[PDB]
């Protein structure tokens, strides 16, 4: 079954640090970052290829405004948000994502929420086509937005445009997007105080989901099994590495299974 | 608050004379300001790159940083990060794994 | 393409 998703997410900071934007924009087709925004540059630019290839130059200059639109807003909104908190200085985020999946097509889901602090704040239900006050500072905004019919235009964005634009991206990017990248994997060994801590990384594959299992003369033995998550490179593949405890002189008796949609059947890697 | 959890590794596995990409990736974290730095021998490596600010599903702030570099045998390398819920700047070490 | 966030 064919299933993509279009997100973008939006973050507006007090305190971003030195040099660096205070407002941020980024959209993602299918878990891969497509178009970018900030408020140093002030526009919209493409960060793939086949986006930059198939939009045309009335894409980029609508967007833009979208994008300045709603640097505009978040720089308001954090005004109003301290004021509502009781809070002068110091460092405050406004975090906003908001999306559509879509599955054989057709749409399976659409979110709008947003967070502040690092805590929930409000969150659209579509089908109560309702806003949820995650908190109290937040009951006035949901008052407000339900007033202005909010829910209506979520509603058909989130169910008709963004969904409408996710089909068109998966077609411009379908290559990209299927392609496969297959890892390079190594087993490393540490001995360190009676312990060998045997270690299985896998380098550069696409797409993002994998399994890297250590087999105990293979049996799929996960007990000492600690993994460090799938963590990005620079250059759109992935990363992930997984170690097991083994006692010293134990090593050959160990081996890293590597399972991947590049791999017609599963890698198996030793010390 | 929320400290960051960083993870260091290269693009390839690294070999002896061979060109590669040091990646510093540091994750689950509140507030978004922090500050990461890779490090060859106790000294900031140039030409590092920095991705832009983004979060995950739970809102937690992650960043990528990244330099082209050629692993000596020789050197130590390492990713030294600050943010505001650690007391002092804190290290990680590269593992060649050559 | 995004969407405009509102004020809140």
């Known amino acids: ?38 408020s140093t540059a002030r526009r919209y630019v493409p960060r793939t290829e086949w986006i930059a290839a198939k939009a045309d130059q009335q894409y980029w200059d609508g967007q833009t405004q979208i994008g300045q639109g709603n640097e505009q807003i978040d720089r308001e909104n ?7 908190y009781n809070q002068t200085g ?97 087993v490393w060994g540490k001995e360190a105080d009676g312990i060998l ?17 250590w087999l105990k003369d293979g049996a799929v033995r996960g007990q000492d099994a600690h993994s460090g998550g799938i963590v990005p490179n620079g250059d759109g593949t992935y990363h992930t590495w997984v170690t097991i405890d083994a006692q010293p002189g134990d090593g050959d008796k160990y081996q890293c299974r590597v399972e991947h949609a590049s791999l017609p059947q599963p890698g198996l890697y030793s010390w | 608050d929320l400290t960051p959890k960083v993870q260091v590794y290269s693009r390839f596995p690294a070999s002896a004379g061979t060109k590669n ?10 507030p978004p300001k922090i500050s990461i730095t890779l490090m060859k021998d106790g000294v900031p490596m140039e030409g590092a790159q920095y991705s832009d600010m983004s979060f995950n599903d739970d809102w937690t702030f992650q960043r990528l940083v990244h330099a082209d570099f050629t692993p000596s045998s020789g050197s130590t390398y390492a990713c030294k990060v600050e943010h505001e819920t650690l007391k002092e700047p804190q290290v990680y070490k590269w593992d060649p794994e050559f | 393409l995004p969407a405009c966030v509102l004020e809140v």
């Open chain 1, 1 to 38: 079954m064919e299933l993509h998703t279009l997100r973008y997410i939006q973050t507006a900071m007090t305190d971003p640090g030195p040099g660096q934007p205070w407002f941020v924009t980024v959209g993602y087709v299918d878990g891969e970052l497509f178009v970018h925004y900030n």
């Open chain 1, 78 to 84: 954090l005004g109003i948000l301290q004021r509502r």
């Open chain 1, 90 to 186: 110091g460092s405050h985020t406004v975090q906003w994502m908001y999306g559509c999946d879509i599955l054989e097509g057709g749409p399976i889901r659409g979110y709008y929420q947003m967070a502040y602090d690092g805590r929930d704040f409000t969150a659209f239900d579509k089908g109560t086509m309702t806003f949820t006050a995650a908190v109290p500072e937040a009951v006035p905004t949901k008052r407000k937005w339900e007033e202005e019919s909010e829910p209506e235009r979520w509603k058909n964005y989130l169910e008709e445009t963004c969904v409408e634009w996710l089909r068109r991206y998966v077609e411009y990017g379908k290559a990209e997007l299927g392609r496969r990248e297959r890892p390079e994997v190594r």
């Open chain 1, 197 to 213: 801590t045997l270690s299985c990384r896998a380098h550069g594959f696409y797409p993002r989901p994998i399994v890297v299992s």
């Open chain 2, 21 to 30: 990409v040091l990646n510093c990736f540091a994750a689950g974290f509140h």
